[PDB]
């Protein structure tokens, strides 16, 4: 549970697709996720309106090959925002810079 | 003015009002009408009334942003007005003999 | 940066590292009124007027640029040069992720009303310097 | 009187609530006369709270008593509304129009004036207590049909003090009102606007000459 | 084992914690053991109740009503009575829809809180990728 | 030159036509006329029913690449720009 | 037969139902009217009717939803106190446009 | 003294740029807003006694008679500029931040 959250770039997932992932029926995910809150290993909030865990906090799983080529890619996609931007930013207003 | 008093309107009452011959004929000169966003609504012939799309509040949307930045060049144009022009007089009055 | 004595817990023995402390200028008030004296230079960021900070800003995000690039080659370097792995370091980078702002964040809504107050003040403001040239 | 007789009865308002305790009979129209015409003008400008202290709670309309038709007709109106009791309103709007309205030469001419405004105000009040009502729970309250009902309140939607839209096929009748953020945007861009035009016209003129 | 079980977090089912308990403690002397207080193990279930209760609101924003009458294992108008109680005490806070569809928890937010939280958000980020950076350096000369 | 103008309009009254209804509104005196018109608009028919769904979507997405643009949605880091050079000419 | 008797009852009929109405609505959301009725000893119609009355004084202001039976009731609604202090700023402007013009007909 | 000294001096800073991106709070935005407009209120009414004549002879006499020492028309160009320009770099910074991070 703590694993399939973190390697998904989405920080929400239903509980039905949690129930798949345990292997254990749905009544008993939901009281599991009330105790991960308690001993704080995820923290969230719990909405029984749409069956959703949003979480706001997710553990440092352990190092990995795998993990760390997903490192890679997220600083990589940020990289180019910057590059953009910053291109943009100088053309306009090029003549006040004082 | 009608879809703006009643919001969920039947075809059949606008035709009786204002003498239109059916139905079909309405949606026809209001289908063309509301492409264009005049009346601002869509229709539902699979039930039956005609429903006004409403925009409510447009501080909460994004309509601000735009009305300002036309504000400030026009405030902005009346500066440069002001000073080009303001400069006119007195060059003429500086170079003429005084006591 | 400080000699500190401490076990690196990896199957590794205690290692004797340096460890960066952030460091900052500070200067005696006898010296301080003759620094201040000796420079009388404009600065490329003094936090002035408005076309100073504006220069700071094209700075800024090229500052940024540079420095996740940093980043980026350290994870190449540690399965090509086998740099020791340093789970302290790729722990600081999960934090960054978790705790990475979204969008569709109600937080979104809210900076979008916030805009739109920012710019009516703007607004105002623009409009009364015209009275007073007017003048 | 003169404010009266003229279509803008806000002055009107005003002037004739202070002529009660000034009254001069001195060649002018009867105290009787004065007593119901600040009553009129008081219902068509007046809030419903600044209603109940100047003119319900007013000494002088209290000392005077209901004693002519005309004073009574109009008096009563007033009550029913502040009370909210829907079901005797509308029976006196009926004898106002009759009794006071159409034979006072002056509101003759303002009748139309009055009796649209006092619908709209009536109305007005009770959308406000309600996110939503029926259309037969609005109009049976009222004493009209739901026919007449539906006519009556589409003339007085878009001159825009009800604030309401009418689902036909669902009978219901939701309210809309803002209260929030975008009351303060409209009134700062609106005014703010009309100082703009100012701006332009003179500025443009001072140049020229 | 009896004391640490309150305090945590934990959901505690009430006749179940009422059940263990019953044939050692609630005959256990003069606490329970009492004529007068044969009826402050009763009492004792509004008290597990209300632990839970104060740690539900916190970790749900939004739960169905029908679902937490069955946790706190109670009778429906009675769990209602207690959502009143606690909120009309200011302890929690809570929204309660009547027909017992929903039952929000809602602490009070404003624009300014949600924006301030933000705030914090994109400055904190900005000083670990800084901190980060020397200790990139530091591995470079140790290697 | 009717049926397109119709068409067009009718994209954003509903999503869903009974296919009775496309029939009757464009003026097809044949089904056929009217299978060939949806294929045309792309819309598919599945069922007997037609699926405006697909294609307001889809041109949507063609349509933010262009390249005018930047100036034309106009960037809330664009708006204070320009202000700002406004003031410091 | 104590008209005194009277005015003074009916101000201590609707104090009485207020002290009472404060404790059933503080944990709001959406109450039903009957739930109301139930406490109160008070018909369903004589709810309504004192109900719609005090939302006008703004004693609590709230709404009546009949479509559900329900009664939300709304506390400090928020408007922009930033705007608030613009409207009195450009209302002098104003003014001082007209005076400035005044002076400025000397040109003229 | 030398120019390799003076950079020296000065000191450049890494922080310099980094206080450049940080977003401080939105609780301050509005106190400015707020106030800076209340303020302008107070020198607006000053303002409308300093035009009402003002234009018969002698200038000193105008200055102490309808106060333009301590000019109230030149505060208030003062106050509105320091506003205008913070409120811009505001915007400013605010529009840089949320798509370069996200």
Redesign the interface.
């Known amino acids: 549970l703590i694993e399939t959250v973190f390697v998904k770039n989405i920080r929400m997932l239903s509980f039905e697709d949690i129930s798949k992932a345990t292997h254990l029926p749905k009544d008993n995910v939901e009281h599991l996720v009330m105790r991960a809150i308690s001993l704080g290993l995820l923290k969230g909030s719990i909405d029984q309106v749409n069956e959703l865990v949003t979480i706001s906090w997710v553990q440092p799983r352990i190092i990995s090959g795998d993990q760390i080529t997903k490192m890679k890619d997220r600083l990589v996609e940020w990289n180019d925002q910057v590059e953009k931007l910053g291109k943009k930013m100088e053309a306009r207003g090029q003549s006040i810079w004082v | 003015i009608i879809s703006l008093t009643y919001k969920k309107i039947s075809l059949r009452d606008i035709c009786l009002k204002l003498n239109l011959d059916s139905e079909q004929t309405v949606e026809y000169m209001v289908s063309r009408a509301i492409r264009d966003g005049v009346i601002e609504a869509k229709i539902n012939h699979e039930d039956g009334f005609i429903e006004t799309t409403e925009l409510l509040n447009i501080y909460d949307s994004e309509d601000p942003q735009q009305v300002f930045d036309e504000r400030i060049k026009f405030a902005n144009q009346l500066h440069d007005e002001y000073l080009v022009s303001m400069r006119y007089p007195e060059d003429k009055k500086t170079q003429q003999n005084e006591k | 940066y400080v000699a500190i004595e401490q076990v690196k817990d990896d199957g590794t023995s205690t290692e004797k590292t340096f460890l960066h402390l952030p460091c900052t200028i500070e200067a005696e008030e006898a010296e301080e009124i003759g620094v201040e004296h000796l420079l009388r230079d404009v600065r490329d960021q003094a936090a002035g007027g408005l076309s100073i900070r504006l220069t700071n800003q094209l700075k800024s995000l090229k500052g940024l640029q540079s420095k996740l690039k940093d980043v980026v080659e350290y994870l190449d370097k540690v399965i090509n040069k086998e740099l020791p792995i340093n789970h302290t370091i790729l722990g600081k980078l999960q934090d960054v992720f978790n705790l990475l702002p979204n969008l569709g964040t109600p937080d979104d809504d809210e900076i979008d009303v916030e805009n739109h ?1 920012r710019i ?2 703007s607004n ?1 403001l623009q ?2 310097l015209t ?1 007073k040239t ?2 | 009187i003169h404010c009266l007789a003229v279509r803008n009865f806000k002055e009107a308002a005003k002037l004739l609530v202070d002529s009660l305790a000034t009254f001069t009979s001195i060649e002018l129209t009867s105290y009787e006369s004065i007593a119901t015409y600040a009553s009129v003008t008081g219902l068509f400008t007046l809030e ?1 709270t600044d209603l109940k202290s100047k003119v319900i709670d007013s000494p002088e309309l209290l000392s005077l008593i209901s004693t002519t038709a005309a004073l009574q007709s109009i008096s009563s109106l007033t009550i029913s509304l502040y ?2 009791d829907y079901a005797s309103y509308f029976p006196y709007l009926l004898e106002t129009y009759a009794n006071v309205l159409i034979p006072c030469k002056y509101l003759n001419r303002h009748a139309d004036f009055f009796v649209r405004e006092m619908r709209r105000k009536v109305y007005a ?2 959308l ?7 259309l037969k ?1 609005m109009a049976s309250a009222f004493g009209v049909s739901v026919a007449f009902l539906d006519n009556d309140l589409g003339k007085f939607i878009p001159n825009k003090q009800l604030n309401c839209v009418i689902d036909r096929v669902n009978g ?1 009748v939701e ?1 809309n009102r803002p ?3 975008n ?3 409209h ?2 861009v609106k ?2 606007d ?2 703009l035009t ?2 332009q016209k ?1 500025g443009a003129a ?1 140049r020229l ?1 | 084992s009896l004391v640490k079980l309150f305090t945590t977090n934990e959901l505690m089912r009430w006749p179940i914690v009422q059940k263990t308990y019953e044939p050692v403690l609630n005959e256990d002397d003069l606490a329970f053991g009492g004529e007068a207080n044969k009826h402050h193990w009763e009492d004792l279930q509004k008290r597990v109740i209300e632990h839970n209760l104060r740690v539900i609101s916190e970790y749900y924003s939004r739960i169905t009503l029908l679902r937490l009458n069955e946790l706190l294992d109670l009778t429906e108008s009675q769990t209602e009575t207690y ?2 109680d606690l ?2 005490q200011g302890i929690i806070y ?6 017992a569809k ?3 928890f809602e602490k009070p937010k ?2 300014s809180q949600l924006l301030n939280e933000w705030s914090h958000n994109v400055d904190e980020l900005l000083e670990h990728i800084e901190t980060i950076g020397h200790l990139i350096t530091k591995e470079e000369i140790m290697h | 030159a009717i049926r397109d103008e119709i068409a067009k309009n009718t994209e954003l009254s509903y999503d869903f036509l009974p296919l009775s209804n496309i029939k009757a509104l464009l003026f097809f005196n044949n089904e056929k006329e009217t299978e060939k018109f949806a294929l045309e608009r792309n819309w598919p028919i599945v069922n007997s029913k037609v699926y405006f769904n697909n294609q307001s979507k889809e041109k949507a997405d063609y349509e933010d690449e262009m390249m005018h643009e930047e100036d034309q949605k106009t960037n809330i880091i664009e708006k204070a720009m320009d202000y700002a050079i406004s003031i410091e000419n | 037969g104590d008209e005194l008797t009277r005015s003074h009852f009916n101000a201590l009929y609707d104090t009485l139902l207020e002290s009472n109405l404060c404790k059933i609505i ?7 009217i009957s ?1 109301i009725s139930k406490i109160i000893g008070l018909d369903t119609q004589q709810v309504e ?1 004192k ?3 005090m ?2 004084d703004k004693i609590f202001y709230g ?5 559900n039976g ?1 009664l ?1 009731v709304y506390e400090t ?25 005044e ?2 007909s ?3 | 003294k030398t120019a390799k000294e003076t950079k020296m001096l000065m000191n450049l800073h890494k922080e310099q740029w980094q206080s450049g991106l940080k977003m401080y709070d939105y609780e301050e935005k ?1 106190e400015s ?2 106030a800076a ?2 303020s ?2 107070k020198i ?2 000053q ?2 006694k300093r ?2 004549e ?2 018969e002879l002698t200038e000193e006499e105008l200055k102490t008679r309808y106060v333009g020492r301590q000019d109230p028309k030149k505060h208030l160009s003062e106050t509105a500029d320091e506003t205008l320009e913070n409120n811009i770099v505001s915007v400013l910074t605010a529009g840089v931040n949320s798509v370069a991070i996200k």
């Open positions: 107050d009516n003040i105002n409009k009364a009275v007017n003048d | 419903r009370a909210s009040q009770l406000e207590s309600y996110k939503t009502l029926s729970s219901i309210t209260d929030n953020k009351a303060q945007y009134l700062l005014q703010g009309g100082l100012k701006l003179y001072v000459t | 959502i009143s909120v009309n809570a929204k309660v829809n009547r027909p929903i039952v929000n404003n624009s | 503080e944990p709001f959301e959406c109450v039903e739930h009717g109900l719609s009355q939302i006008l709404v009546l939803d009949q479509g329900w939300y609604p928020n408007q922009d106190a930033t705007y608030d202090s613009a409207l009195e700023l450009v209302g002098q402007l104003n003014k001082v446009v007209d005076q400035l013009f002076k400025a000397v040109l003229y | 509005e807003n707020l407009t209340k302008m209120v607006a009414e303002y409308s035009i009402e003002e234009k």
